[PDB]
Design a protein around this ligand. Sequence first.
Ligand SMILES: Nc1nc2c(ncn2[C@@H]2O[C@H](COP(=O)(O)OP(=O)(O)O)[C@@H](O)[C@H]2O)c(=O)[nH]1
Ligand SMILES: Nc1nc2c(ncn2[C@@H]2O[C@H](COP(=O)(O)OP(=O)(O)O)[C@@H](O)[C@H]2O)c(=O)[nH]1
Ligand SMILES: Nc1nc2c(ncn2[C@@H]2O[C@H](COP(=O)(O)OP(=O)(O)O)[C@@H](O)[C@H]2O)c(=O)[nH]1
Ligand SMILES: Nc1nc2c(ncn2[C@@H]2O[C@H](COP(=O)(O)OP(=O)(O)O)[C@@H](O)[C@H]2O)c(=O)[nH]1
Ligand SMILES: Nc1nc2c(ncn2[C@@H]2O[C@H](COP(=O)(O)OP(=O)(O)O)[C@@H](O)[C@H]2O)c(=O)[nH]1
Ligand SMILES: Nc1nc2c(ncn2[C@@H]2O[C@H](COP(=O)(O)OP(=O)(O)O)[C@@H](O)[C@H]2O)c(=O)[nH]1
Ligand SMILES: [Mg+2]
Ligand SMILES: [Mg+2]
Ligand SMILES: [Mg+2]
Ligand SMILES: [Mg+2]
Ligand SMILES: [Mg+2]
Ligand SMILES: [Mg+2]
Lengths: 132, 133, 132, 132, 132, 133
Amino acid sequence: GLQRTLVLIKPDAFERSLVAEIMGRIEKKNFKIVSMKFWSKAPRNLIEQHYKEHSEQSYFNDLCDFMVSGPIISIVYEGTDAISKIRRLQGNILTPGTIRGDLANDIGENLIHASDSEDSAVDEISIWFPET
Amino acid sequence: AGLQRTLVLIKPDAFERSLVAEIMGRIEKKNFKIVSMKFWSKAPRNLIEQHYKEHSEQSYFNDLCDFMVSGPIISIVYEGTDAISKIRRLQGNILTPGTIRGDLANDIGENLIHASDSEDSAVDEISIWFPET
Amino acid sequence: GLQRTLVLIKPDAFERSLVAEIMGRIEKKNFKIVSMKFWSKAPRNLIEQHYKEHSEQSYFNDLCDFMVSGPIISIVYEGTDAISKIRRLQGNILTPGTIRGDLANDIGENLIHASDSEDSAVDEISIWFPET
Amino acid sequence: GLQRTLVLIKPDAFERSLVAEIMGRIEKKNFKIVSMKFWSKAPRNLIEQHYKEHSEQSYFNDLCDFMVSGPIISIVYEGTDAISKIRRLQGNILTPGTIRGDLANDIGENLIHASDSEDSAVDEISIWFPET
Amino acid sequence: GLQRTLVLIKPDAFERSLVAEIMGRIEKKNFKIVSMKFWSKAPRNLIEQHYKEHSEQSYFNDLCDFMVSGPIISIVYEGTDAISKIRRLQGNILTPGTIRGDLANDIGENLIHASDSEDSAVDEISIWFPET
Amino acid sequence: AGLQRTLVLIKPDAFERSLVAEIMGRIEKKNFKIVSMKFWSKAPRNLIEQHYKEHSEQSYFNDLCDFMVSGPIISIVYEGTDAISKIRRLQGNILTPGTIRGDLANDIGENLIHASDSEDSAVDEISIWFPET
Ligand SMILES: Nc1nc2c(ncn2[C@@H]2O[C@H](COP(=O)(O)OP(=O)(O)O)[C@@H](O)[C@H]2O)c(=O)[nH]1
Ligand SMILES: Nc1nc2c(ncn2[C@@H]2O[C@H](COP(=O)(O)OP(=O)(O)O)[C@@H](O)[C@H]2O)c(=O)[nH]1
Ligand SMILES: Nc1nc2c(ncn2[C@@H]2O[C@H](COP(=O)(O)OP(=O)(O)O)[C@@H](O)[C@H]2O)c(=O)[nH]1
Ligand SMILES: Nc1nc2c(ncn2[C@@H]2O[C@H](COP(=O)(O)OP(=O)(O)O)[C@@H](O)[C@H]2O)c(=O)[nH]1
Ligand SMILES: Nc1nc2c(ncn2[C@@H]2O[C@H](COP(=O)(O)OP(=O)(O)O)[C@@H](O)[C@H]2O)c(=O)[nH]1
Ligand SMILES: Nc1nc2c(ncn2[C@@H]2O[C@H](COP(=O)(O)OP(=O)(O)O)[C@@H](O)[C@H]2O)c(=O)[nH]1
Ligand SMILES: [Mg+2]
Ligand SMILES: [Mg+2]
Ligand SMILES: [Mg+2]
Ligand SMILES: [Mg+2]
Ligand SMILES: [Mg+2]
Ligand SMILES: [Mg+2]
């Protein structure tokens, strides 16, 4: 069940120097980088598309601002069951053992994004890596 | 907005085993800040008995108190969003990997760390270890 | 009370350099090594004895071929409630915080074996450490 | 023979979340904590006492302002040849393997203070732990 | 003395899953990613330019082959004295505490490249990140 | 081409302090492979005396032998390019940070690890611990 999924390393990760720590956990679980981009500051449009689902939520504008308040890295990861597994690896701020579980403490500043489904992964990859 | 304070004790087994920084580091990495901290080469047994007052009619009480005064302890007040429950989850238990107790401890009693389990316990415990409120 | 349990570090751990990582996680939870052997290649009979409960499954031959494709280490660990605790440490590939959860991504190539019961434990120890 | 030495964890360590990292390196080399205090803000007189040997240097006021710009932890460590060994552990920003070598990149914001001699040691301990 | 320098993460780093480990050491020393590219397979021309100094050495062709045998990451790092410091961080396979010192064991497969001078850094950055 | 073998001993202090995996991990991370390994809950004192034969007329000899039989040891043969000297550098000494002894040990005698210091010592020591050459 080989899959590709999309990961974003959020600006709080740079602010807090957790970038390598985060990528290390994914690497140590045996997933491979297919492609990767560094954005010293991501175009707002890209963030807006990425989080389009949320444009009606009240928090949507704070969320874009944050995503644009420092660098992000966009990564395409590949491996068996990658979408589901990396999602689990990302976890939530309540569950220790996971990325957000060990390292994050905020509902907004939570370090990493990982596609949550087959469809969102295909969509998300096309946003950040349109050259496909 | 969600900001809380909670009390943590580093227990004597953590010193015996050199896990003090390991334990504090897990809490630090989850973005909690130290707000005050005390090193006790031996904690006054009266502080302990109070801390575990809710356990005074248990079989284990006197061994527990004995263990807690058997080596150094560090009391720490931590601050951050939802600190009481988040630091509690981090503490976990010896059955759940990913947590401090889950990864590092293997005893009912020698379990390395105490964290307040609720707002009331936190206010109460912080009072005990940091009376200069 | 104390128990002893048997652990095998599988060939994928050597291949991926996770031997010390895996043994470290067991060491940190305070379990002690009672017995240990290194097999640059484990005799196939031993492997077949070890997985005899599986001798009818279609994956049996492949499992054994894998277990023989590189070195393994067999270890007897001692500590309170060892069998069950090291089992939980082992986990599965869906559970962050565990050896297999953090480090493994395959159903078969999963780094570590831990006895699953007092009976299997006693049995597996005699297989690998018959001298006792 | 045993010595005691004084260590200060500086405000940049708290700012960058390296407190446990730094204390860990000292812990792993087998030194024990005899005394420890946390100062959300250290009294300026203490800092000026501590760096009194520097009171004539042009950086003196700035150093003190830095040392007062965040929390510090003062620690008395005990162990064999503590003063010299923890000094080496501390190192400088040019020496990989040391606290400052791996973690620091500035001449002044350099994470840790360690007493440099038996005299300065005895002195610095009385400054921070006069009750003794 | 703020500087930018060029780092390559070599294919042996991917092969051995040390990518995050390597970037972590640089990150933990407080250097910042200015820009970054992932090459699933770097154009041979780029490698040839990068190592042009060596085109007369006997090992030059083996070296290019290796640099092209798997992915590389090219990174521009920024910080005080970045060229010299990251160079020291890279070290050599003889000196523990450094990247090649802790993790590498071959004169050719040594995990990381870091510009060794002001001129080579400007040259190297122009190769991998010509958009400047 | 440059391939060698060298003998490593994990000493009893490493078990007492739970540093076994930490020590082996540093060697593993530097790309050296285990070629054979033995666990000794107590090493035969005759093996020790031989291992440290070159030290038989020293003040410290009997304490050293006592220490080496005071808890488990693991003997390991490691293989890799230039293994003898590279694993030696990794061992280092209690004065140099970055090394095993530099980071983890603080005693002349309780220094966690032994590594062969030359081709001759390696052949000789490997003979001792792995006589089935
Ligand atoms: N600033 C802010 N961001 C939020 C809030 N709630 C959610 N978000 C962000 O928007 C995303 C919404 O959560 P969700 O759609 O379930 O994505 P997930 O967290 O990756 O599972 C999260 O990743 C958060 O980063 C909020 O209350 N404030
Ligand atoms: N020695 C011993 N100590 C116990 C026992 N049960 C509880 N304790 C001590 O008291 C605590 C019991 O848990 P609880 O009071 O609910 O707080 P918790 O430790 O944070 O879960 C443990 O941390 C132990 O240190 C026991 O059966 N034996
Ligand atoms: N290749 C393969 N191996 C399997 C499969 N099911 C079980 N195994 C092997 O058996 C183990 C998983 O189930 P089991 O033997 O009952 O328990 P466990 O090994 O302790 O998790 C793994 O170690 C696998 O190596 C399968 O469907 N395919
Ligand atoms: N800002 C600044 N601080 C300095 C300078 N020289 C020394 N210091 C301070 O003094 C220390 C370095 O020299 P010194 O005090 O003699 O010994 P050390 O602190 O143990 O390394 C550092 O902790 C600095 O904070 C300088 O040129 N500028
Ligand atoms: N395959 C191979 N590569 C080499 C050899 N010697 C040097 N190299 C490679 O080419 C570079 C030459 O070394 P040098 O110019 O001093 O660069 P440095 O290692 O980064 O300091 C090294 O980075 C090696 O990766 C060799 O004998 N064989
Ligand atoms: N207790 C004690 N042991 C020593 C002393 N000197 C040497 N040794 C032991 O023998 C070794 C001396 O170093 P050497 O024989 O050259 O081998 P090395 O340990 O790898 O440096 C140390 O590892 C110690 O374990 C000493 O003064 N006291
Ligand atoms: Mg989602
Ligand atoms: Mg408790
Ligand atoms: Mg099974
Ligand atoms: Mg000084
Ligand atoms: Mg060079
Ligand atoms: Mg020795």
